[PDB]
Amino acid sequence: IETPEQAKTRERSEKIKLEFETYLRRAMKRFNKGVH
């Protein structure tokens, strides 16, 4: 209803942040299981 491009950019930024957080979580899990 207002700046659909801005909404798409916000959604893409949220998706990128979620992907980076999942990558960090899986890297931490890999490190922990390797240590174990």
Partner: protein
Amino acid sequence: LEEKNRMLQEDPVLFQLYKDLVVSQVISAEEFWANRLVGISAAFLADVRPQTDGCNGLRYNLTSDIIESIFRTYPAVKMKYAENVPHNMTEKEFWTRFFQSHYFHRDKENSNAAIIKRFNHHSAMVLAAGLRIALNLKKSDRYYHGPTPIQSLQYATSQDIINSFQSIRQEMEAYTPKLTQVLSSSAASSTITALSPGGALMQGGTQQAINQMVPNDIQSELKHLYVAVGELLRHFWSCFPVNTPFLEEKVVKMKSNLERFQVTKLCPFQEKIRRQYLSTNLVSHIEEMLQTAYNKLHTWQSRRLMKKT
């Protein structure tokens, strides 16, 4: 009281008139106020759009007129507003939900059927809410001599006039043009004197500046008095002709109000002129009108008394 006060504030002249009529006890407020006393369009959805400003501005401009039109067309929206605003959700949140809901963004056989049903329902709701002699005169000669009064039409003497008709007929039968006889120096001087300023033809002359003789504040006061007297006399003559007993009492009250106004406002204004010794007879017109009204009322009272004899 609140409704009455706002009316006076909008028109300061009326408020001044109200003060001069009620506060000065000329008339009562009750009698003062006794005399003083949208289609539906289908474009309310398509034309009304969320306005996007230059920098992320949702200029809703949620005027009540559009909201009422939506409620008339869609009672479900009104029901949701009543059951949610302002407890379950705020008005702005409800509008945002409506914009984001499938109700507004209706946009494949199922989708086409849904769109058709929505359009038919909208049209039906709009329609439902839209309801919620030949003339043959006798004496035409009256038009030949109409409002013109009987003139001085005089018929001449007997047959001798025809002889006079002969005389001119014989007088101008042998006619020759003339030049000297047309005008003379003495006649020219007389014509100039008649046409000269201050002569008989030049009727009157210059006048006096009445505008500067009467102060502008006095002019405004005279205008206000004229308006008040004119309104009172219009109310007086509105009752006339008196065909019911109530009109008699109303006219008596009107005369009492006129007398009170004349005593309270006109007389001190008169001295206001008299103290300034203005030679203009501005009050004379007011006196003439008041005396005409009083004479008319007295004559009608005399007629009423005579009818009962």
